[PDB]
Amino acid sequence: ATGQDRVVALVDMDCFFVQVEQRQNPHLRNKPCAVVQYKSWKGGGIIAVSYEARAFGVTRSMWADDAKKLCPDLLLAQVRESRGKANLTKYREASVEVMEIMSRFAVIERASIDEAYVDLTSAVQERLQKLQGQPISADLLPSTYIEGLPQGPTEETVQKEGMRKQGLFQWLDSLQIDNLTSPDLQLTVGAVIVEEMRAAIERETGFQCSAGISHNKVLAKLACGLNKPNRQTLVSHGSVPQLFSQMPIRKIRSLGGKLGASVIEILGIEYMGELTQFTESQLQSHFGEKNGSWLYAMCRGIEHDPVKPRQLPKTIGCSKNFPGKTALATREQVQWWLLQLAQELEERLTKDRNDNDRVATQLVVSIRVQGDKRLSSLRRCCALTRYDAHKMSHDAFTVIKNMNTSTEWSPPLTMLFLCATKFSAS
DNA sequence: TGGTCTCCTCC
């Protein structure tokens, strides 16, 4: 198998939170700007950065005071604060706009707030039967890059738009259109549809996005990041060997952490391509049966993880960190914040019930204690029977009350997390 | 480092 059975796209919103704030406030459009939370501490922590601001070296998690040193004219929008904490409602509602448009075209898997995988196989087939064997014009692909192209010989390729076009021209001239079963053709038609999905998103919301088109989710996701912002990339099966030959392992989705580090360390390699020299059994012996098989196929551009038909979140939660000296040290402090979180949760749950005809049946409560390395010190669950903040906050307190070893609380709490899960039809 | 989150696997 060559892993060419599907056409898969991944659509990803450009500097998402920034665009949401720029739509609402025209003064921020086409300028260096960032989205911050909690203005009183070092100007706020940056959570999203415009491309104009990135050119100055501004990144996520920079304090805005520090970002102003790199970019003096940097403009800022603040996350809404409600019930004593950052509130992301605006961005979740903006997300809904985008997901709904995309779901008119095909089955989506909502992977995050601002990205969805699209399974385009069927849409591609139908379109190929509609076209009537007609040639594909370059005008149908005005923002598409073909990864690996242009190659060979040929005052045009000096500028980026010039390169894109020569690349696209070479691809289209070489396309055999008379055969409806050609994976390259399928991908091309898949890219035509994504141009239309992206045009629809921009028309109906004003947000711009990037997209990757390939044969699986991982290559689609890799493809998408190759030409940002506001552009889409086709990564064909044939492009993989050259692409993978200098592709750092950590750039592939799910290899950005400890597992990716172990591949590099154990095998003595740098690049995704280098993985081809190892047998499936060799990879299985190092990283386990599932990862080993996954890597064997992946380094050859083959992956089988399906686009799951799901556009609603499986969990609805909210949390607050209480770092250093702000750590919660009294029973009444703990009960107060549990109530704030519960109240926001109640509102979001109630909305979710009316919107999507479903109820959460489990409440998960998670905490961190001061001086614990781990990201969580304790997760406990209970039944969620009523969408009632007072009940949910009191029940949350019950199940964690045993952690106190002192009405003082010790050790102090650095984190609270309430999460509603286990949805069933209502 | 940061902060408010979601999805997944392992045992």
Added chain:
DNA sequence: TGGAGGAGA
């Protein structure tokens, strides 16, 4: 009728 952790938005 679970809880810890990894990996990413």
